Amino acid sequence: FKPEELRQALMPTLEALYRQDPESLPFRQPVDPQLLGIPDYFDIVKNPMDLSTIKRKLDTGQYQEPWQYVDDVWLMFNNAWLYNRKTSRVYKFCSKLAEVFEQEIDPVMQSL
Numbered sequence: 451f452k453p454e455e456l457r458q459a460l461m462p463t464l465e466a467l468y469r470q471d472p473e474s475l476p477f478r479q480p481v482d483p484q485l486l487g488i489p490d491y492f493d494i495v496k497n498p499m500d501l502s503t504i505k506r507k508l509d510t511g512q513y514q515e516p517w518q519y520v521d522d523v524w525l526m527f528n529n530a531w532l533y534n535r536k537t538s539r540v541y542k543f544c545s546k547l548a549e550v551f552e553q554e555i556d557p558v559m560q561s562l
């Protein structure tokens with residue numbers, strides 16, 4: 451896969467996530483535990499991930515294969531479901547994005 455081919459193919463799946471508003475808002479920048487006053491965040495989440503990081507990796511051609519992109523998107527979701535309680539808005543927004551991602555990534559992976 452050329453990185454331009456991955457970027458062209460996968461960027462619309464990422465755009466679909468950013469289009470979810472307000473559901474994407476907590477995911478658009480890395481969690482900042484100082485600002486949010488949650489010093490245990492990095493005790494629980496050892497490999498942080500967010501949309502800005504994924505976007506940067508796509509933009510710069512850091513993914514060799516599409517599964518690596520998919521793995522990072524799932525890492526972001528898994529981190530949020532891990533840290534946050536299921537009653538929280540952030541966990542529910544995570545679930546909403548995951549549903550959108552599933553629906554958009556499926557045909558794309560098949561094309562590829």
Ligand SMILES: CO[C@H]1CC[C@H](n2c([C@@H]3CCCC(=O)N3c3ccc(F)c(F)c3)nc3cc(-c4c(C)noc4C)ccc32)CC1
Nearest residue numbers: 472473475476477481486488491529530533534539540543
């Ligand atoms: C610049 O705007 C942002 C919106 C999300 C704000 N925020 C908020 C704020 C705190 C105030 C209460 C509140 O409702 N927030 C909030 C704000 C907007 C949302 F869309 C949302 F779901 C939640 N909580 C966040 C939680 C997380 C989070 C993620 C993702 N994974 O683990 C943790 C913890 C990330 C961001 C959170 C921080 C400022």
